[PDB]
């Protein structure tokens, strides 16, 4: 599960809401640990 | 991170070259459909 907001709220260009800033836990080298990863995804790859 | 402004990806195609190329395609299609027909190009229908 990813928690996402728009990458640029200010932008009014045609590319509005296409890039989303998503946060997720993913995994680490060790089984017992987790991290927090922030990354950008395109709207076409992410479904609500 | 996206540095600078967020911009839309796009292609530039010269209008005159495309118009001449398409006209040539129309002439060759007329050879199979007739000299008194109308050839219309339109956008692709909805789908993936």
């Amino acid at each position: 599960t990813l928690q996402c907001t728009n990458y640029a709220p200010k932008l009014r260009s045609m590319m509005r809401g296409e890039i989303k800033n998503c946060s997720f836990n993913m995994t680490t080298e060790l089984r017992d640990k987790k991290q927090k990863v922030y990354s950008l995804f395109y709207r076409l790859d992410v479904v609500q | 991170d996206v540095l600078g402004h967020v911009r839309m990806a796009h292609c530039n195609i010269s209008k005159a070259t495309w118009n001449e190329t398409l006209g040539k395609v129309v002439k060759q299609l007329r050879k199979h459909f007739g000299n008194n027909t109308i050839i219309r190009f339109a956008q692709s229908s909805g789908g993936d």
Partner: antibody
Amino acid sequence: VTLKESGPALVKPTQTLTLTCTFSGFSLSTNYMGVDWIRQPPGKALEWLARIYWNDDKYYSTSLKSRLTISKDTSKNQVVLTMSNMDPVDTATYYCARVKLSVWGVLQFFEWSDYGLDSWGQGVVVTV
Amino acid sequence: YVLTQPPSVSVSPGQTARITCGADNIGSQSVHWYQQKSPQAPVLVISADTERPSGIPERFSGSNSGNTATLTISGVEAGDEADYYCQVWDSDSKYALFGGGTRLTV
């Protein structure tokens, strides 16, 4: 970038007000700059009236949609604002100003930002 | 969507004044700031929250986040006090919305 307003000083009730703003240093439909109109009643904050963009787009304040009309003539380097049914409450200093847009990408994709009103005219005072 | 400004900010000479402009989700739109002294058209002091137009003293700065936009003017002198206004162009409704103005007092 100079803008100069002209119009009547005295307006009768119900009379239509006409304001003309002449541009110097820029022109519409050549560059990507727009022009709008703002009014300021005496002792009150500025009230936005309406805007015209370089691409013939026209926008109006929701309070004056039934009364305010604007037009552009690029051969004269002029913009005209008109308002029907002028009322005593409409006494104000009227200004025209240049809407400067910062363009970084493709205009077809609206790749620009509203930079604000950097250059204003001097305005006229209209009393109804 | 309404832009709410304080009616005034009163400061000592040289003290920093904070002129705010609140509205729901103001941090999602660019806020312009203007300075009006004499009954003449105002001069733009802040462009898109963080850009200082050329010719404006370094005393002028600002930011915009959440529900509050702020104009910070450090080093206030007798020559700076003015009625300051916030303006936002709302692309969603395609019109410019103006605040009520804030008067500075030295």
